[PDB]
Symmetry: D2
Subunit: 493 residues, 4 copies
Amino acid sequence: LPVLLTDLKIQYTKIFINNEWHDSVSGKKFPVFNPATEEELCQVEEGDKEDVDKAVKAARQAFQIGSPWRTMDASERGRLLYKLADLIERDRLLLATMESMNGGKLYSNAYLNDLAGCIKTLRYCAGWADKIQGRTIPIDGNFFTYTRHEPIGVCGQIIPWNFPLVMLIWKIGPALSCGNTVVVKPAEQTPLTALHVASLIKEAGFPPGVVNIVPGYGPTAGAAISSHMDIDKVAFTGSTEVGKLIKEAAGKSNLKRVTLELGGKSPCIVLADADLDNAVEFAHHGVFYHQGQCCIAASRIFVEESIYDEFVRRSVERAKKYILGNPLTPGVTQGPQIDKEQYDKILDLIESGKKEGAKLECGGGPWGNKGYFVQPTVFSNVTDEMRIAKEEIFGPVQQIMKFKSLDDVIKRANNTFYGLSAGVFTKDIDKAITISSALQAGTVWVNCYGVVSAQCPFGGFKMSGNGRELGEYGFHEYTEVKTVTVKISQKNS
Amino acid sequence: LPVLLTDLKIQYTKIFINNEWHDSVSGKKFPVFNPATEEELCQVEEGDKEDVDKAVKAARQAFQIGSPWRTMDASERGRLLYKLADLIERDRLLLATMESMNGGKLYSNAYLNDLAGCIKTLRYCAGWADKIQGRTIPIDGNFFTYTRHEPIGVCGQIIPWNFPLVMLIWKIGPALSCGNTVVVKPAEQTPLTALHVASLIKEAGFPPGVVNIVPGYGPTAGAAISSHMDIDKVAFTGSTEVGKLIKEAAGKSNLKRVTLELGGKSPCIVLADADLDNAVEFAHHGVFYHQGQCCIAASRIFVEESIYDEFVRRSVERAKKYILGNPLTPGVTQGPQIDKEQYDKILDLIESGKKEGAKLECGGGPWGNKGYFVQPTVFSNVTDEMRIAKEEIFGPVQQIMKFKSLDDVIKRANNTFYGLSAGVFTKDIDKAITISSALQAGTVWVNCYGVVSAQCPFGGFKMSGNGRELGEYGFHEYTEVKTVTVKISQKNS
Amino acid sequence: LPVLLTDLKIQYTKIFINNEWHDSVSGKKFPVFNPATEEELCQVEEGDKEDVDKAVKAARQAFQIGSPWRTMDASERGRLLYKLADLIERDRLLLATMESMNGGKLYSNAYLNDLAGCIKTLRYCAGWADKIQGRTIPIDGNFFTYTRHEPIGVCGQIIPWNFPLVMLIWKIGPALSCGNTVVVKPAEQTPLTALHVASLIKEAGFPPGVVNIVPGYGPTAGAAISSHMDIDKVAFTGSTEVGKLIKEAAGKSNLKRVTLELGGKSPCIVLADADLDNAVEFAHHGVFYHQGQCCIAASRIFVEESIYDEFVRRSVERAKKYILGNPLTPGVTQGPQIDKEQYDKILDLIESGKKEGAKLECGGGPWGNKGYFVQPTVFSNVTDEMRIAKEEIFGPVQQIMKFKSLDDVIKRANNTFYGLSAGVFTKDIDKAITISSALQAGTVWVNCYGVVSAQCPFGGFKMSGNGRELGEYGFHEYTEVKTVTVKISQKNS
Amino acid sequence: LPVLLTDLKIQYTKIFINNEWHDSVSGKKFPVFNPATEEELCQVEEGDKEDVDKAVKAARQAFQIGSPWRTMDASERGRLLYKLADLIERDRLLLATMESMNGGKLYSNAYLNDLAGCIKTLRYCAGWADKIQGRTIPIDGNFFTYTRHEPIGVCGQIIPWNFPLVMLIWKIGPALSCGNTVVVKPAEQTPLTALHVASLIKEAGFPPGVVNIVPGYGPTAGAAISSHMDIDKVAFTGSTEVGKLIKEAAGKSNLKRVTLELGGKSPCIVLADADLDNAVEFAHHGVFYHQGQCCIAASRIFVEESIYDEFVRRSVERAKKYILGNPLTPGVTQGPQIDKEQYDKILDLIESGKKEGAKLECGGGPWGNKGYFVQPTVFSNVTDEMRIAKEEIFGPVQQIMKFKSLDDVIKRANNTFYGLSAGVFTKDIDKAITISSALQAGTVWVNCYGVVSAQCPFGGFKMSGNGRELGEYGFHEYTEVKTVTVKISQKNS
Ligand SMILES: NC(=O)c1ccc[n+]([C@@H]2O[C@H](COP(=O)([O-])OP(=O)(O)OC[C@H]3O[C@@H](n4cnc5c(N)ncnc54)[C@H](O)[C@@H]3O)[C@@H](O)[C@H]2O)c1
């Protein structure tokens, strides 16, 4: 069971460059807030273009040929990553409590799901460190040809606020495993866990300048990271508008490599032959997980007509059993929304759903005076023209849509520009294989949902992002291929 | 549709060495018979130890460093294989007719299933020719390490009689693609198609000595191939007893590499939720294909109790629709057995099945005065202790067994020393995945049977054989890994 | 030897959509000229936004689920590619002559290097067609996870004029092999060979709409291809400025995948221990190949000080043996420049080199009143600040630079924003590996130059492009990964 | 620096079955001796056929479907291997001292070379644990086909005495990583370190029965392991005669998979252009490492004629600087031989070399009254017909042979039935590549020797073994491929 949380004292609130702690060049500090109580946790140094510039200088120096990080053995890189994972596991309680407090997330989920995933991903990347290999090629003519997979260079990574630690680890695992150096920009809502992890990275024994962390504001620091000319690759997780902005900024400077992890409107199809209890439980989990603040949240629940009513009824009942309170309080299953802006956005989208004429089963309003709490909400009879069926709500709002024919529901689920995930619930094998082949989603789950692991590559199809993460194919993205061809006297098979 | 067969004239009946035709040293020639009418086709030169030694000398000389075959480009090897496949496709009619006459197999099956499979396998291997690659390894220390996949050397291959052309192609495809040279020994029952293919190989433009064919008797020629010290690898397809002898002989001399493909008592499980018509059709196809002369033939049809009777009834009716006659005759679907020894063995096994007390539904006796025809036969109420449930009949005899609980049938199907194949018929995803995981078979088929393609690796568990064929893993077997490590001044990631 | 060229009649001058020939919507036709004689070959239909839109509609319809191209077997795609390659080999003479006339390239080089490379690349892609595979993943929990590599969708490809057929094949090989559909835009200078290949594609038996070709002007047709919302991927080969524009336009529209091939200022290092004759011959070949109109042309010839003088002298002698004349004339080694704009650009760059104070050893002016011919040119004592040492000349101009220290020359060669290729000439084993590791180029040659093959991946590092082509890693670029995870009752190792 | 050794107390001297310590069924115990002083260390239980049978029963029960080891996650297997490696690193001193005492090996080499290699190999295998993957195959027809790589089953491993811990780890790393269960038979000379590691394995938390260790005599316990029918695979490291016997015995029983790691007569070619000091140092190291008791020991030192004499002189001087004494004593560079039988065999081979007429430079006789020490020995003018040039001496005896032509020395080095290793010393890239391609050895070193790491596969070519170890290809050997093909309604690319 999770261990009781203790007093939280925050000491790391600065810019982490060259294994040192620097104040911002301008000298400005922005506050950070607690969603559960609307209180300032602390102040954090505000990074801008100068800080990003000096961080990139430090990383570029650390990436030079002959530097301690470039001549280091790959097995040693894996060893360093394992030591970092062990250090994280040592401080599991403090990191979980900081994640819960800062990001307004349930302590049990911030302990048994977040840090476990972080540790597993770190250890997986550490295992992959010394096992990615080039090739030897049977080229025509008297030649000996091979290909090496080298680190790309300097990678600038932009983290979202919904999973600070998990996304941070997913960004700095494959990057450090392949040998790159990173300058990371955490979200302005949740910058603390990344700074503590930076202190742990310094303790672990990474060479100075390998990992640098600049906390600031996205429009200034993130733009500087994306428009920098000395940065070789940029990885970004967030909204599609900022994703387009990042892509265009990269197109305007240095033609750097770009990896995007944008959002999506994930459908969850339930067929007449599916197990009803499992389907209900996993649909509720898919839409209501982490207060609905997930990129892969099942927002459009397609349910076959013959079992529609019953499903809806049970769904309603489940939404009533959800309890809403302070994250650190035991027994709660839903915490507050991240900040006031998303809170007001969710309220506006719920009101728009009511205005467009969608049946309201449970919820549909705010909860509590202090904090940002929204009641679990269910919208039935959602048509394809409603805004709640098109725009990513990113909140605890569930839509239940009806269908009769399989081809029609396939065309409906593929009728979007979001291709991040999909879910199919059925007992048949032919239906499962056919639907999983037909759907245009980066990940298709069958009889389950929200199942992510470090091994399986993850990404979006159409506009949910470019590239994949968490896998051998994910590790492919952080390396550059160099081909060497040597003229030899004579070749033999 | 298949094109009408023509007159057959057989010219190639000698030993094929160094792209030449040699009489055997002993001067002895053994006849070859036609199963349909019991007539001598022609006399074929009888290979022996001296002929095998001569062929091995030729192949070893053709494998020397700097020889035309060793300096040849891999793409050129693929080009030669494609030319061989086009030449085979040019002579599809003559090869199909020769296969039908020699092996006693239906002309339609010899044309639409054998030649097509040979062509597809040859083209697949030709594609693989120049795409197998070594690796570059991140070894510790200031070293640069890579690995090359080289041809093993001389490979002696022993072919069965049930699929002469198909097995010959499966042997000389991966071997020639990886650059090896082959000395093959065809079955004494069906030597002619391999000799015609040898003539085609000479026409295609392979360097002399790359492919050598020695037709003879297994105890003399096959043993000489297996006991030879110059031969580097031996591949053998045939019975388990001869395979045991081959493995022991290889252990005695030269410690050569051994690949064994042996038979098996393949189960075929049909569950209550399976589609009855498809299950009946594919079980009938699986047991009765090629007069049951297949290594993967479904010999133990486990059928769930609640649907037992009905299934049996339908099965019986299907076995009555089988027509037995001359292979070249249109409209026939079953030909004669390969030779009289197997014919009498099948009759003895049927009589023993009758004696042990298994219900006889259809067949159980010979057909026709001239030929080696056995009526299609069905045995019901087959228990685990019966000999027909333990010994590979290799004839058109079908056993139907009853079960109730899934775990019991799993233990029954795994209670054997054969692991070649299996088959599951069901409409449920969970049952399909569970059974396919829990079965100890090299290939598991769900809702189908007898589906073999050049892309998927093929092999057996337990005593069914060692190694795999027809795939990247199959191409792994015909290569040897050489690791080269070079001391360098300094290494960088 | 190359067969004698014959008369040329050009019938294919329209837009190729849905295996049909359409006039442009506007109705305008632009002429195409012959560099050797400055004569109009014929008028070609001028494609614009409407033509691109209807071609993309046709391709999208051809890519629909259940269409003939999507249900077709991968082996059948390989078969179609092989048939296309055979059809090309049948019309080798006409295609070589058309390439020589349109692109102003030597007939011997067109017949022996362009057509052979196209055929080899097509056959290599056809082999790769049915051998790219997903994976099965040992995910945690009672789950079964696999990954499929599907075609991306519609791919718009933009071809340069220096290697029309070769680049066209390098584009439509990996795209059709993975199952995608293509809308290609040929260069306005050389559109004819692509149209003839389109007619051959129709003859081969590809389904309608799989391949579409729109000839036009880049600022109108290429921009419409790069900004189209429906198009899934864009591949572009050309100048860095247009590539920057393509990247920005893709960032503005639906965030399509982008592959870029851009030029570079490739260095060629010659050390004191290198074989002088081979180094001289291959440096001359590297810089002067195809009138210097190559992306990988060795523009900066670094030569060690102690062997500088002699090398230069020998180089001068070689440049005097180069003969300049009409491409179809036998015995010529250099043809005309592609068009007047590049011709004047080359003359201006030569004059600027003269002005900045580089020693002129041979050439430096035009040859011939009729045509676009520039004498082979040699510039010695080139310093790092001269424009001829920074700006890609794309003409028969050679720069010879001097160095003394290995580290300094490494820094000089890496002191650029181009990373396309590099060349090292030495007899040592430590120097070769050290320099090949230390150079920031996408392809490093040792003791050779200009060695390209379908097997080895090809691409640029910093601003020479993104991604790779011609290889397994190249085939990785044209596929999208879909992860399917199924909840199972129980998993076993 | 190595830490000072302490008092050694040995408590583990029994048979390790089902995470328990059992006395032998017979009740007999054989002593174990210390080579340095010829003293009994302790008595170890003597395993025979009954003990092997019950160990195989325990392992087979542990391998059953649904058992804790089979349902365990692959990441958990890697975690267990990492915990075992950490436990070994905790007891580095005791294990190093036990290895030094039992095997008569230098304490500094036992600490800085054996324990480090064991830890690195264990961590490498633990990383590989959850990263080996099946495939999904584009099979023809409306089918979905994939392949899983399952554990083979029960593996019986036979360890030599030269590197007890290192070979034990090389055996139980890939076996446990792929999920198999092991019954291991250690050498009768050095059984103690394996027993201590077994106790550590029990402490780490492996399920009972996963690892079982039976110490005994090779002719009885090893034969029982190799002839057992319930055993699925056998891996054996040792002499070629016993390997031949193992292969034949396996061919007589249940056709189990066989992996052999036999000996070799490794050449070491030194060319005129090689660095003399590095060549001398690494040749001396290669021949004299671990008292010459290595499978890859460079026994035939081919040196080019023009630099022969000088090399020999320097070699002689190096052999005089070797110091012979007790292993635990600091400063010593050579310990005693393993036991008296090998000691007398080495003396007999030295005497035979003297008799056949080979010039004796240094050594050639015994050293010390108590112990099994042999003086470092150098034999010059060794011809191809001498027994010292053919038979693996396995002792500190060095042969120096002369050559003049590269082709002749290539033929000489390939004129043998051993193919384990080779070494080339040169400063030329063309010579290095040519010789490394031409040599028939499983591992070719350039300008170095005796460089082994967990990443690079290791094995012999002709009669030095069958298979590879320590790498992805090495991990291929411990898995079986199962192909699953499912009939689907319709397939799409
Ligand atoms: N492969 C090459 O030909 C190549 C490689 C590197 C450098 N270059 C440079 O290219 C110069 C010649 O310029 P060029 O444009 O005639 O050849 P190019 O190779 O740059 O051709 C660019 C391609 O993109 C198209 N295009 C043009 N403008 C476009 C636009 N605004 N948007 C989208 N597509 C557009 C063109 O039709 C052509 O197919 C040479 O002087 C050389 O320096 C060419």
